[PDB]
Symmetry: D2
Subunit: 256 residues, 4 copies
């Protein structure tokens, strides 16, 4: 075990930067390698078994880079590839399904929103009983176009969330992009606790890695970005979501 090594984080694109930010806030001295599979984004409308294979090849790439842990920041890739990926690999592997499902278990009536793949996967029912679950495809592009505070967002939120139970006490924001929409989602579902995948996973990663002696108290915190599509396109989209991307390199889908 080498605490000097980086933590790998991966997602289909820029959305997983919500998970990276939450991690960096808790672990300001860790080195992160953030991998965005922008050549094959989005994952949410692909076959779950195809996404599972993507996760395997990206995990191997991150292990060849020397990481001491892997975070699956994507809710679709977590749904497709966990728990098995964590069972199959020696390094600690963390995803974004279990921590929010665990928190959800302290409510009686729980909902899930996410991509098509995520809601159809059955991943969340493995860990928490769900009263209601709804795929919300337009949420991701609405966020990537910068419109989370626009009334279009409130109108789209109404279109997806109107028919949710009056019962609901909690809603899992089971997609990387949904923290940007807490405003609109909350306006449409007053009272309902909103469970943020990034914050609850960041907490679990920081806890578990401390527990195992894998953190580096002497480190200088920094992030390197690796993408499969065009680096400048990524950097521009990341800036629209409020992330300054300093170092980015394109990784060949051949290197996988």
């Amino acid at each position: 075990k080498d605490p000097k090594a980086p933590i790998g984080v991966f997602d289909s694109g820029v959305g997983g930067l919500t998970v990276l930010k939450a991690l960096r806030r808790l672990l300001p001295r860790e080195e992160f390698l953030y991998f965005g599979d922008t050549a094959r984004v989005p994952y949410g409308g692909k076959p779950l078994a195809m996404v599972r294979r993507f996760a395997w090849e990206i995990a191997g790439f991150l292990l060849r880079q020397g990481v001491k842990a892997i975070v699956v920041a994507c809710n679709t890739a977590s749904s497709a590839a966990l728990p098995d990926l964590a069972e199959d690999l020696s390094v600690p592997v963390f995803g974004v399904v279990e921590p929010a499902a665990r928190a959800a278990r302290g409510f009686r009536k729980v909902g899930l929103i996410g991509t098509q793949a995520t809601v159809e996967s059955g991943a969340y029912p493995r860990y928490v009983d769900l009263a209601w679950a709804k795929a919300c495809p337009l949420f991701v592009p609405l966020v990537e176009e910068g419109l989370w505070d626009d009334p279009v967002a409130l109108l789209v939120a109404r279109h997806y969330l109107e028919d949710a139970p009056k019962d609901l006490e909690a809603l899992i924001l089971g997609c990387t992009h949904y923290p940007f929409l807490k405003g609109a989602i909350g306006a449409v579902l007053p009272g309902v606790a909103l469970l943020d995948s990034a914050e609850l996973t960041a907490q679990e990663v920081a806890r578990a890695l401390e527990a195992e002696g894998l953190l580096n108290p002497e480190g200088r915190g920094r992030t390197f970005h690796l993408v499969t599509g065009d680096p400048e396109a990524y950097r521009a989209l990341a800036e629209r979501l409020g992330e300054r991307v300093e170092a980015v390199r394109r990784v060949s889908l051949e290197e996988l």
Copy 2:
């Protein structure tokens, strides 16, 4: 040589069924092979050179199936791969850029809307001078989510089309999906001629094929669908856009 052979049509997914529909209306006796690359949809956010390689791959597949002609129904793939693909192949090859650019030449001030790849490609400026061009990313998912006639669509159209020159005379709808949004776009850009890629291309294909003796006079029209992703997922989405998919099978990306 063989007018009994099918016409190949390809796109990234279901959006190109607007081109298929316009073609079938003008050529009800032809056999069509419609190829939707749903494993790698969408193309609009990919590198143009990557889309160009996809098109080469899919054209080869269609030629091995025995097609007598190829229609690139996708505006992004047309932008990436034409005119070179038509120069490189013996069979007649048609796209959705040139016919609408041609029609646009009968106007003094022309606009273009499309995907990021399409507007940034410069494909359209090669055939027609443009006063204004604008990438409209949210239009595709808005259409696939069935919302093209809802208030949200008018608001999204306003968001993208507000800064359009007051003196525009025509707008190229340079994306497979955008014929669904004529109401919302017209309401926001009253007075502007909206040029439909599907109908103008289907007109050109029917003309050129008759002119070369490649139409099948006495055939019984039908369509076979080929997709690289899940066939049932595709059949469901095609119905949401008003196409009844009867015969579909999955083509392995290894088959390419």
Copy 3:
């Protein structure tokens, strides 16, 4: 852990059946999944980093089949991928480099023959000091053509082995195919102990698995053959190497 689960064995092709046969002789109750990557055979002239990525891909596939252990039967893939693959994965992972290198440390002067990739990798020197190493490219095709008892095999053996040091005590047969050449190689190097990768690895697998409590004490083993190329071509070539392939199916490289 479940001892009724199969053991995964993988190679580039038919050569690895030498390892499967030895394994099955020692472990007649175990179920084996033998994976032959015949779409991409041979490995010996490919870049080591490319073979390393193949190994990762195939290990993931085997893990998705539920194996309780993995044997890398190929000396080229072992050289490319081990020890890291065993460090990175939770199931026991065995290769064909370490057991013979271990046996070799009981001799003063040790040689190695194998593919180009194997001899240039430096995998064997990590475990045993070598006096002489030679790549022998024609050996593999000689075996696959069934000529190991022909005089051409003696002449080719001489071509490769004549300049070996006359004080050599042991020779590592560092390639799946080379047990078929024991006669010829022994003729040309009388008195040199020939260390056979299949037998020594099988011994280690049986040893290690018993110590872990992972062997199945009841029931009767079977073999399932999985190849990435044409199954009838594989069956024909295996028959020449003396294996009667019962169950074989083609796995798509897209399943990988």
Copy 4:
């Protein structure tokens, strides 16, 4: 339309340099792009349909470099991909099957040797009636090992050609490597005319391009080497075959 443009030549690897050398002898003014698919060599043991797909990929790549003509120097890839590749493409496309098969039609009894894929393909029989056909797998690695003039070459030739009909008049050397084995083949098959693919194809290319007005009358053409595997490995194999390669670039299989 531009005779300064290069001529593309492709093969699985170094074997095709026999075709390149014959071309350059006849056409000292032409620029050549020689493409060696060393990442995926050899083709002779792969499914024909797989090789056909490789040929399509590499052809598109060469068209993106601006070639004015394509020569398929590989007999296996010619067998897999022609004549359809020539029919499907606008630029002149030449292979190594037809010219030797044409020359063979001036003989009563004709045999064929080549790879497994070539012999199984039935490519030659569509152009010339064959009395005998035999796959000769060991010939390629024998040549690449530099053993073509040695006694072992004679014995391998005897092993393959022994059962050849005594009344043969001509034998098609249907593989890139076989010109190196004329000595051993002719010693075993005295009195049989040996038809050389490289010389008969280069002859046809020069004739056809001249008649088409595509030759550059003022050129001082160079050769560029492009390979999908490791350039240095390629350079060293070429040297074993008597070609000094200087300018070689690695082309990613992802560029295809």
